[PDB]
Amino acid sequence: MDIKYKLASYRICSPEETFEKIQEALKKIETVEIKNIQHLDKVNIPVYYLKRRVVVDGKEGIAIHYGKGANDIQAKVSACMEAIERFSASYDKNKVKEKPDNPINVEDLILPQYADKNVKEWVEGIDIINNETIDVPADAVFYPTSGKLFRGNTNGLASGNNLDEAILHATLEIIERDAWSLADLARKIPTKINPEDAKNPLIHELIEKYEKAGVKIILKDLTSEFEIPVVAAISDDLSKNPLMLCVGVGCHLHPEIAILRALTEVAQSRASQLHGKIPYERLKRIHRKWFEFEGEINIADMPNNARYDLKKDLKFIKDKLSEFGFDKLIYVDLNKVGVDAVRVIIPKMEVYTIDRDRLSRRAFERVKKLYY
Ligand SMILES: Nc1ncnc2c1ncn2[C@@H]1O[C@H](COP(=O)(O)OP(=O)(O)OP(=O)(O)O)[C@@H](O)[C@H]1O
């Protein structure tokens, strides 16, 4: 049991501690400014940004990274670790191989129609389900990319206090996007979550902050086959302020953490929007799918498989993925500035919600089993 589940984080140490440990990497990534932007939105949910110096081609400028959380420290750490994760993903001429000994079938990654399957640059990764090395396309690992195999994305990029922690987060993200992808294909999302029985009072606190600012919040269950809670927080802003509909999605072994991460996601999208009208018929479509519901469950009804131990958590996931024919769980260590940072790749997991050009022929069948 190496996980401190205090308040709203599920990490090996407190966010305060993490913030302390990362100061040097913060200087290495060239951070200019770390600003709280909680009071940009009427909801008063902690959201931060980090700006950092970045040179593209020859032109220097600024890159921004947001962070979210149920308290200030979490959100500040979140923006920092978000920034480190991104910096660490750049492209590393020393991690690339040209004649791979063990190349993955690129087809398994789910390829767009325009995919250049003639992959020149590979990267050695570790399949932790099969305890083997496996070579994966650089396009699947780094960000940003040329986009030859597929359009570059950040799905599966995570940083963390140690490697396992980074791996767990990235795995939960992959699961989240896969489940959301299936949700995107469903005609209706029928099951509402009633959060009243939450042991963690931060859930009630976050709903209230939404209600008091005139934002209705509805929680929907998007959990897939793996019994790893995936939750959508659907927000409708009925105030004078210019935002309306949001939707943020959270995933975790603990259903309550999934819920919190969904709530804080909405918070982050709102603030990043604010740092800057749906036609009837579309609104009607959105109402029927995202707002209406058939059934309602309690948090108590949802699976909870968190064992508050990284090894036990990963074991559970590895086994669950494996059980359901998702037979590889691949990571690539992307540490650059002395903080843990990974790419996780789980072949066959959908990414459609992030890249509409990528959808496998298995998605339909999975949608029918899970929904109708
Ligand atoms: N307390 C923490 N300790 C170590 N790493 C953290 C901590 N909080 C966040 N991170 C890392 O920073 C990155 C951003 O985390 P966060 O949960 O805010 O965003 P996310 O889950 O990527 O969702 P989104 O970016 O869509 O808002 C992730 O790589 C995460 O693992």
Swiss-Prot record:
Transmembrane segments: none annotated. Residues 67-372 form the YcaO domain. PANTHER family: RIBOSOMAL PROTEIN S12 METHYLTHIOTRANSFERASE ACCESSORY FACTOR YCAO (PTHR37809:SF1). This is Uncharacterized protein MJ1094.
